[PDB]
Design a protein around this ligand. Structure first.
Ligand code: CLA
Ligand code: CLA
Ligand code: CLA
Ligand code: CLA
Ligand code: CLA
Ligand code: CLA
Ligand code: CLA
Ligand SMILES: CCCCCCCCCCCCCCCC(=O)OC[C@H](COP(=O)(O)OC[C@@H](O)CO)OC(=O)CCCCCCCCCCCCCCC
Ligand SMILES: CC1=C(/C=C/C(C)=C/C=C/C(C)=C/C=C/C=C(C)/C=C/C=C(C)/C=C/C2=C(C)C[C@H](O)CC2(C)C)C(C)(C)C[C@H](O)C1
Ligand SMILES: CC1=C(/C=C/C(C)=C/C=CC(/C)=C/C=C/C=C(C)/C=C/C=C(C)/C=C/C2=C(C)CCCC2(C)C)C(C)(C)CCC1
Ligand SMILES: CC1=C(C/C=C(\C)CCC[C@H](C)CCC[C@H](C)CCCC(C)C)C(=O)c2ccccc2C1=O
Ligand code: SF4
Ligand code: SF4
Lengths: 80, 73, 73, 61, 138, 73, 743, 155
């Protein structure tokens, strides 16, 4: 039940969505950058906290922040 | 006694260094400016930005515990 | 042990153990209520620090008491 | 603040806070952060440039 | 969907879904191919994808997504669908959920989890103490 | 036994005092209400404090260990 | 049929210093400038990783053939150095005159800071550092009697190093073979089996028959080294060889007439150790080399190369297939011909195992003369080869994981043994983990139980000879069978292969050379401890190699790479999940296992084998029978071995062994410094470096290369390196000081 | 209490003990042969060293104790070596700082830092022999201390 939050400094490069291994992020239309797209996290229930997106973010300070909160079966990555 | 007292000084200063650094850099740092947003004790921020192991202030305390044991020893 | 090996080797090891327990006859009836998992990152640091601290204190306590006793007794 | 204009950063969380950087380009599409600034130093992610806003930068001389 | 769809020729392995998947969520991946390619199963091994329709079951969403990533990279296969099956039997469409890849901007998607301004404007933990509010919350 | 007892407890107590101070900075400190305060100023020049503590610890370590090993050699 | 032909490219790479001034030229990322201090570490970390530089197998093969030549040249320079030290700064002639009284030494310390005290009174006129490398014994066994031969050998070694330098440069800038070359595994194996090993052993056997045998025979007969005829005289004047060995009167005729039995004067099978020097009979050693040479030569004609006759490794591999292994060994031939990492893993595991076997066989059956009587040399050689073997084994596991992460192919590994193993890797690792738990409990728990019993005064409830007994009946039985082998299963053998199995004791110079090593309850427990530690370390390495590509925690570990820090603080934590980290942990476990193994050898040898013998046969060991009742408890291992035997390394100050004591302390420091890098993370060091950088900025003295903390993986590597260095150095100084001060 | 080593019996006892330790090993060798000359040189050095240290102060153990309180009578013990160390290390630090300041003016300072420019490096190394004077005038001109540097959140 980790909380993924996107901030206004996002440049819409999609690297976070491309580097996310759980289909937790996506691209939605936006008007805050020339790319016309912004990162979104509508499936945070599947997030595990690997922070691959945080590592793939190019902004100075990560425009996508993953906060580790409630722990569930999906977040613990348990195949058993 | 002079030499061991200087060693005692080395230990006291290094322990207070780790602890003072943990307390002052508990709210933020150039590596993680939003440390205050993650609480006092959290594992890390992932391998991004070169790596952030033991970034939290709790780890500073955990690193200073070894030095306190050494100094008091 | 806990101060050197970090979580990830133990997580996979526990997964292997989980497979072994749920794939062996006459022992499948017994099912864990809580899914086995490796000690957390911070939990590992605290457990290792507690072990190290307990050992440091107990070792020097035994040494000092035994030495001061046998030497003057 | 225009093409290649030295500007000092004001963002606190920025890795290049209180540092001077050059302006690569300035947006004109009415975006939230339209000033792209490049620096000689690199941050922990190996990236040297980033976008900022007018209120987050101060022109130098 | 199409639970009778043919499955890739795999010889078992001990890394597949366990009993937990039976009483809990079990993901499935259904993709179509034109050549009997050999792909590394996410559970450890090598399998041959049947020419035509391929359907397999996994115990994690990440495993299915990783398999899809390799099917899209090692091979030019983009028509991969990942579903979720519950113990009750109701299927759920998970990937791509809209017929378009997540990194490809598409209309109709609503922004979720957005915070105004940069992270430097987050309130201090002391200002939201003893309340059900977080720093990232504006 | 008593000297070692109280000294080890003292080490644990001071390390805990520093840990709680760090917790105070993260959870019970709001810079908005502490403007140009002695505590706020401590956080303002934290880098200087850490750098000087590091220098003192390094100087003491280099010199004390150098003298001990020189005498040993 | 494939032609085993040589094809090379001329002037493929130009010889110039242009690329020397551009560090990181071999890497695309490292050639763009540092920008941070991490680039300096990455430059050396990826310097020898030729597979990461280019994606062509031909280039990697050439970069390996060369650099192999460079390492061969480095080895030849080191050998030349050893020979020159023996010829110029060693008491080799004096040692030859009195091998038992003179202590070997080939190092002379300069008088500068009081270090001149390290020049121990080793005897023979000169005073220096006592060498425990066995160079003196080896040279004596080779027939060296004068220092002129040592000088000539050193010069020859230097020349060979120069040749290995020229060959390395020539095979990379003048004639680089194509990938077709290096893939001829049949030809390479045939030549290495019949030419590098077969012909090598044959030539060494010839040298021993014509040089070692006569010279050593005269030396053991009371003849002075200066009065012995030169080696060439034994070849030119056949009368001398005939007098020393009548078999030479018949000449080579008996060999060609199959009357090999006429060579009973030079080709003997006595079986035991020489009672004059304590080592193996040189005649048995020469006969052994001859047999191993003939066997290797015959084995070198198995594979098919450029002719119809021979065998195809691929055909043999594919032929082996069974019901429990679908495709058997199909696809393995292509694996070992297209990936140097796989070959390196197999070769490293075998080379390490060979080194360990060498250590055991060398101590049990001292091959060189006066080697057994020189306990310092025996301890150092067993411990040295044991350590090099363990390191090579861990490296074998690491390279297996590397191949699995980078060079693995699902198509090649389809339904074969490798694929079938990866399929059930969970059964392998869980069952092996269960074995490890059982071994640890039944091995260390026995020791813990004995500690608890002895502390409670309940000695009658211990696992010892007096109390509950655990006798290695199987090992004791094998020893008895070996003791009786020279007369019921080895008809032509005149004595047991090793006196450690039984027979009688051998004494040379009032010192025990080799006596039966009786096994008891203590040996039972220690051997089980060895098995337990070996099982845990192999479990760690096997786990890292089997899950190197993927696991239930990280479904795509292969894409992340073989050497990556972690996947982040997700899924509960994925730290040290990569295979590289498994090798990192395996290093500590291998160190623990090897440390316990060398500890057992040292203590057992000093308490039941090494010692002195008084007239009439009375035997007195260094530690009289204390291992029987002291090696069964951890307290005994800490009191009778770590504390009692350390007195020599701590009291060495003020004498020639002071250096060891110093190294004993330094090692500790290093071992304690490693903890810094093992119990800490780079986030904290990065923040500390930020504060230090601010201090530098305040004085306009900041460096252009942004200072950064050590990478997570680099930090782990530094920690393990320091840990192993400190531990091995501490046990090295302790072993050397203890064995030199006494015995 | 501390007394001059020349008047302390412990110092002479230690000297005699060391001479005896060397002579014991020297007796085994022969007058004119390898070694035995090596031990005689050591004995002479021991005599010279003790005669040199006799001026120092030592207690009951006979080991020379160094007074660092700053007394002029003991300036040679710590004051003089302390000043000479500070001069050498100040020279090292000042030349390094000047080289860094010059490299920062190049096109790619990183390359200069990796591949040192021996000409300019030696130019700044040879100079600086008056670093105490160069430290000043740099401070007075304001070219030594900085004004604004990198600082994280909560300055
Ligand atoms: C690669 C290993 C190696 C190498 C390089 C050598 C090299 C050498 N060996 Mg040798 N050797 C080896 C291994 C090796 N050996 C092994 C494994 C054995 C078995 C243990 C021997 C046993 C051996 C013996 C017994 C002798 C040599 C000898 C020699 C030298 C001359 C050989 C020769 O041509 O004489 C040829 C001798 C002959 C008798 C030729 C056989 C056929 C003749 C022509 C018979 C016809 C009759 C005719 C009138 C000659 C009468 C001879 C009779 C009186 C003996 C030579 C330098 C000889 C030597 O020089 O001693 C120092 C010598 O006698 N070796
Ligand atoms: C496998 C061998 C082994 C190992 C791994 C250990 C491990 C340990 N021993 Mg131990 N020991 C061993 C063999 C071993 N011992 C043997 C064979 C003996 C003789 C039977 C002893 C006798 C022994 C005693 C008497 C004590 C230990 C203690 C300890 C613990 C120290 C805790 C620590 O973190 O270090 C801390 C390290 C130090 C404080 C430095 C140790 C020694 C140096 C020379 C002291 C220098 C002091 C100096 C004033 C410091 C400043 C110098 C600096 C400025 C340069 C540690 C668990 C001590 C303990 O109880 O834990 C506190 C304890 O007092 N051991
Ligand atoms: C033997 C064990 C050991 C040693 C020696 C040190 C030493 C040090 N620690 Mg430390 N630490 C340790 C264990 C150890 N730690 C453990 C187990 C932990 C718990 C994880 C910590 C956690 C820790 C933290 C959190 C911090 C330190 C810090 C420091 C430094 C303090 C400043 C100082 O005294 O500098 C003086 C230098 C020395 C004492 C080292 C001696 C000088 C060397 C030998 C000279 C250079 C090498 C020489 C030329 C020989 C090599 C030649 C080459 C060819 C091989 C210092 C270098 C603090 C720091 O960074 O200070 C600013 C810091 O904050 N440590
Ligand atoms: C002076 C003759 C010479 C010259 C001018 C060159 C020049 C070149 N060589 Mg080459 N080479 C030579 C001799 C020479 N080589 C020899 C004798 C060998 C056999 C070992 C090789 C084998 C070889 C290989 C396999 C490769 C090159 C490559 C190259 C090119 C780039 C790498 C480089 O030079 O960086 C400079 C690197 C060094 C100076 C480090 C070398 C360290 C030496 C060999 C051993 C150190 C031993 C030991 C650790 C020392 C103790 C230190 C301490 C621990 C005490 C470059 C044009 C590389 C290439 O990519 O070509 C384009 C390539 O892969 N060379
Ligand atoms: C009977 C022929 C023969 C012999 C004796 C050798 C011997 C050796 N080979 Mg080799 N090899 C051969 C044929 C042979 N090879 C053929 C036909 C092929 C192609 C199929 C290969 C392909 C090959 C590769 C790819 C490699 C070797 C390597 C090695 C060395 C292994 C390292 C070692 O154990 O140290 C032992 C060292 C010695 C005992 C010193 C002896 C050295 C002398 C010069 C004998 C070698 C003669 C040489 C093969 C041919 C001379 C050529 C001539 C034009 C000068 C070793 C010296 C490895 C190596 O180290 O690279 C350099 C390696 O990478 N070989
Ligand atoms: C014939 C033996 C052999 C060979 C040919 C190789 C070859 C290779 N290894 Mg391997 N390895 C070996 C044995 C071998 N290894 C052993 C025995 C171990 C167990 C220790 C390992 C463990 C290992 C790991 C974990 C890794 C490799 C890697 C590699 C590759 C890159 C090496 C590199 O560039 O790092 C550069 C080398 C250095 C920077 C030198 C490090 C120095 C260490 C600390 C040794 C210090 C020794 C010295 C005695 C210390 C005392 C002196 C001191 C006071 C100065 C390369 C193909 C790496 C790889 O595959 O890339 C991904 C990799 O990660 N190796
Ligand atoms: C231009 C070289 C240079 C200069 C002028 C300084 C100057 C300073 N350093 Mg620094 N330092 C340097 C190099 C340098 N450092 C390097 C290479 C390192 C990495 C080992 C460090 C690591 C370091 C730390 C951790 C700390 C300082 C600190 C300080 C300040 C207080 C004194 C001190 O503790 O020094 C300490 C010096 C060392 C620990 C080792 C110095 C390394 C060598 C021996 C000297 C540099 C030689 C250089 C290559 C020469 C270039 C010559 C050029 C002409 C080619 C001071 C302003 C302290 C501070 O933060 O300020 C309060 C502090 O804690 N330094
Ligand atoms: C049972 C008699 C053997 C005594 C035990 C010690 C044997 C030493 C060899 C080790 C492997 C064990 C032999 C069975 C193995 C064996 O040879 O089986 C037979 C089979 C080989 O026959 P195939 O028909 O596959 O032959 C085709 C290929 O081998 C082509 O060469 O091997 C397997 O496929 C299973 C491999 C391991 C199966 C899991 C067993 C793991 C347990 C390991 C511990 C062994 C006991 C420890 C000592 C108490
Ligand atoms: C197979 C067959 C036969 C004969 C086969 C023959 C004659 C085989 C001959 C094999 C030979 C003579 C091999 C020679 C090997 C090596 C020699 C002679 C020299 C080796 C290197 C040395 C001695 C030096 C080693 C260093 C040392 C020890 C240390 C280094 O730091 C320095 C350095 C100097 C390199 C007969 C039966 C006769 C008939 C024929 O038709 C076919
Ligand atoms: C009478 C007399 C005298 C006097 C003296 C004086 C007056 C001084 C002092 C003193 C002092 C003065 C001391 C002290 C100490 C202290 C300490 C030990 C501390 C601490 C702290 C900590 C540990 C922490 C803190 C914090 C933090 C962490 C953060 C937040 C905030 C706070 C603050 C909480 C003498 C003895 C000389 C002599 C005789 C006469
Ligand atoms: C101490 C430590 C550090 C800090 C260690 C550092 C920064 C070591 C690197 C310092 C180098 C060796 C000094 C600079 C050497 C220069 C080349 C200067 C040479 C100047 C003359 C002497 C020639 C980490 O970064 C770290 C990271 C992850 C886990 C554990 C740790 C860890 O324990
Ligand atoms: S933390 Fe990992 S799983 Fe979660 S959104 Fe980021 S990349 Fe995706
Ligand atoms: S490797 Fe370090 S930073 Fe990464 S998840 Fe593990 S503990 Fe955290």
């Amino acid at each position: 039940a980790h909380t993924v939050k996107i901030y206004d400094n996002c440049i819409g490069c999609t690297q976070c969505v491309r580097a996310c291994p759980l289909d937790v992020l996506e691209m939605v239309p936006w008007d805050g950058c020339k790319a016309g797209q912004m990162a979104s996290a509508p499936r945070t229930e599947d997030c595990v906290g690997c922070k691959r997106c945080e590592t793939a973010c190019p902004t100075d300070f990560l425009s996508i922040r993953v906060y580790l909160g409630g722990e569930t079966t999906r977040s613990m990555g348990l195949a058993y | 006694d002079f030499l061991v007292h200087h060693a005692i000084a080395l230990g006291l200063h290094t322990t207070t260094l780790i602890l003072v650094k943990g307390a002052l850099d508990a709210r933020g740092s150039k590596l993680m400016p939003d440390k205050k947003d993650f609480g006092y004790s959290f594992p890390c921020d992932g391998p991004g930005r070169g790596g952030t192991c033991d970034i939290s202030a709790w780890d500073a305390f955990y690193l200073a515990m070894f030095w306190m044991l050494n100094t008091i020893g | 042990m806990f101060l050197i090996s970090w979580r990830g080797y133990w997580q996979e090891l526990i997964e292997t153990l989980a497979w072994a327990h749920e794939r062996t006859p006459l022992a499948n009836l017994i099912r864990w209520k809580d899914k086995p998992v490796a000690l957390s990152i911070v939990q590992a640091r605290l457990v290792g620090l507690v072990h190290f601290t307990v050992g440091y204190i107990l070792t020097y306590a035994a040494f000092v008491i035994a030495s001061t006793a046998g030497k003057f007794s | 603040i225009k093409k290649g204009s030295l500007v000092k950063i004001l963002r606190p969380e920025s890795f290049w806070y209180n540092e001077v950087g050059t302006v690569v380009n300035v947006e004109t599409s009415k975006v939230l952060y339209p000033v792209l600034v490049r620096f000689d130093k690199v941050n922990y992610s190996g990236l040297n440039s980033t976008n900022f806003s007018l209120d987050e930068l101060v022109e130098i001389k | 969907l199409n639970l009778k769809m043919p499955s890739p020729s795999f010889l078992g392995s001990t890394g597949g879904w366990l009993r937990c998947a039976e009483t809990e969520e079990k993901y499935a991946m259904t993709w179509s191919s034109d050549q009997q390619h050999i792909f590394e199963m996410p559970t450890g091994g090598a399998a041959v994808m049947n020419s035509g329709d391929n359907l397999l079951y996994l115990a994690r969403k990440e495993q299915a997504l990783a398999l899809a990533t390799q099917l899209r990279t090692q091979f030019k296969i983009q028509d991969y669908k990942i579903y979720r099956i519950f113990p009750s039997g109701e299927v759920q469409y998970l990937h791509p959920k809209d017929g378009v890849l997540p990194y490809q901007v598409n209309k109709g998607r609503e922004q979720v989890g957005r915070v105004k301004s940069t992270i430097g404007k987050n309130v201090n933990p002391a200002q939201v103490k003893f309340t059900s509010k977080a720093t990232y919350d504006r | 036994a008593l000297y070692t007892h109280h000294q080890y407890i003292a080490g644990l107590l001071i390390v805990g005092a520093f840990a709680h101070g760090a917790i105070f900075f993260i959870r019970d400190y709001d810079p908005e209400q502490n403007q140009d305060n002695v505590l706020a100023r401590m956080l303002a020049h934290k880098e200087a404090v850490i750098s000087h503590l590091s220098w003192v610890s390094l100087f003491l370590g280099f010199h004390t260990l150098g003298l001990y090993v020189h005498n040993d050699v | 049929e494939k032609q085993v032909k040589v094809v090379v490219d001329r002037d493929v790479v130009p010889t110039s210093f242009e690329k020397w001034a551009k560090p990181g030229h071999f890497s695309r990322s490292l050639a763009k400038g540092p920008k941070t201090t991490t680039w300096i570490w990455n430059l050396h970390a990826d310097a020898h990783d030729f597979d990461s530089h280019t994606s062509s197998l031909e280039e990697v093969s050439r970069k390996i053939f060369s650099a192999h030549f460079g390492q061969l040249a480095i080895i030849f320079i080191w050998l030349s150095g050893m020979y020159f030290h023996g010829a110029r700064f060693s008491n080799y002639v004096a040692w030859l005159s009195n091998p038992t009284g003179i202590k070997p030494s080939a190092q002379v310390v300069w008088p500068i800071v009081g270090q001149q005290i390290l020049n121990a009174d080793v005897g023979g006129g000169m005073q220096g550092i006592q060498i425990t490398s066995g160079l003196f014994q080896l040279w004596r066994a080779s027939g060296i009697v004068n220092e002129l031969q040592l000088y000539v050998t050193a010069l020859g070694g230097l020349g060979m190093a120069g040749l290995m330098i020229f060959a390395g440069w020539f095979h990379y800038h003048k004639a680089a073979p194509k990938l077709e070359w290096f893939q001829n595994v049949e030809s390479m194996l045939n030549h290495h089996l019949a030419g590098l090993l077969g012909l090598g052993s044959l030539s060494w056997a010839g040298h021993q028959i014509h040089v070692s045998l006569p010279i050593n025979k005269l030396l053991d007969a009371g003849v002075a080294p200066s009065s012995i005829p030169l080696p060439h005289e034994f070849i030119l004047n056949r009368n001398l060889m005939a007098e020393l060995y009548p078999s030479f009167q018949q000449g080579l005729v008996p060999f060609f007439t199959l009357n090999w039995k006429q060579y009973s004067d030079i080709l003997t099978f006595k079986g035991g150790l020489s009672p004059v020097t304590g080592g193996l009979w040189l005649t048995d050693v020469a006969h052994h080399h001859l047999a191993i040479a003939v066997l290797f030569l015959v084995a070198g004609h198995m594979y098919r190369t450029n002719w119809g006759i021979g065998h195809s490794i691929k055909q043999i591999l594919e032929a082996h297939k069974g019901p429990l292994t679908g495709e058997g060994h199909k696809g393995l031939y292509e694996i070992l011909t297209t990936s140097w990492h796989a070959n390196l893993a197999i070769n490293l595991a075998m080379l390490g195992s060979l080194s360990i076997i060498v250590a055991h066989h060398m101590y049990a059956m001292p091959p060189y003369p006066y080697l057994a009587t020189d306990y310092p040399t025996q301890l150092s050689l067993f411990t040295h080869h044991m350590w090099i073997g363990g390191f090579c084994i861990v490296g074998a596991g690491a390279h297996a994981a590397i191949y699995m992460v980078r060079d693995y192919s699902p198509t090649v590994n389809f339904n074969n043994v490798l694929d079938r193993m990866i399929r059930h890797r969970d059964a392998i690792i869980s069952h092996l983990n269960w074995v490890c738990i059982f071994l640890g409990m039944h091995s260390f728990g026995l020791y813990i139980h004995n500690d608890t019993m002895r502390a409670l005064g309940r000695a009658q409830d211990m696992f010892s000879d007096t109390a509950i007994q655990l006798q290695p009946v199987f090992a004791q039985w094998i020893q008895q069978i070996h003791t009786l082998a020279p007369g019921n299963t080895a008809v032509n053998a005149l004595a047991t292969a090793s006196y450690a199995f039984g027979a009688d004791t051998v004494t040379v110079g009032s010192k025990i050379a080799m006596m039966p090593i009786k096994l008891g309850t203590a040996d039972f427990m220690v051997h089980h401890i060895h098995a337990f530690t070996i099982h845990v370390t192999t479990l760690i390495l096997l786990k890292g190699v089997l899950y190197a590509r993927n696991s239930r925690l990280i479904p795509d570990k292969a894409n992340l790479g073989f050497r990556f820090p972690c996947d982040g603080p997700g899924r509960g934590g994925t730290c040290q999940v990569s295979a590289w980290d498994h090798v990192f942990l395996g290093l500590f476990w291998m160190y623990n296992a090897l440390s316990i193994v060398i500890f057992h050898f040292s203590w057992k040898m000093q308490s039941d084998v090494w010692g002195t013998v008084t007239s009439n046969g009375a035997i007195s060991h260094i530690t009289g029978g204390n291992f029987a009742q002291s090696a069964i408890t951890i307290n005994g291992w800490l009191r009778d071995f770590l504390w009692a035997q350390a007195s020599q390394v701590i009291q060495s100050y003020g004498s020639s062994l002071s250096a060891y004591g110093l190294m004993f302390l330094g090692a500790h420091f290093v071992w304690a410094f490693s903890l810094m890098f093992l119990f800490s993370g780079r986030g904290y060091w990065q923040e500390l470096i930020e504060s230090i950088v601010w201090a530098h900025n305040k004085l306009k003295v900041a460096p252009a290369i942004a200072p950064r903390a050590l990478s997570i993986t680099q930090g782990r590597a530094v920690g393990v390196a320091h840990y192993l260095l400190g531990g091995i150095a501490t046990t090295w100084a302790f072993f050397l000081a203890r064995i030199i001060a006494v015995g | 209490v501390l007394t001059p080593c020349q008047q302390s019996e412990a110092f002479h006892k230690r000297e005699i003990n060391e001479v005896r330790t060397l002579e014991n090993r020297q007796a085994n060798y022969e007058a004119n042969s390898p070694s035995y000359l090596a031990l005689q040189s050591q004995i002479d050095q021991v005599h010279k060293r003790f005669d040199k240290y006799g001026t120092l102060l030592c207690g009951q153990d006979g080991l020379p104790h160094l007074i660092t309180d700053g007394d002029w009578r003991h300036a040679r013990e710590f004051t003089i070596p302390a000043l000479l160390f500070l001069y050498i290390t100040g020279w090292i630090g000042w030349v390094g700082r000047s080289y860094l300041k010059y490299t920062k003016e190049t096109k790619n300072p990183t390359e200069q830092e990796i591949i040192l420019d021996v000409p300019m490096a030696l130019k700044y190394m040879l100079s600086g022999f008056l670093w105490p004077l160069s430290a000043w005038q740099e401070y007075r001109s304001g070219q030594l201390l900085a004004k604004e540097d990198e600082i994280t959140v909560s300055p």
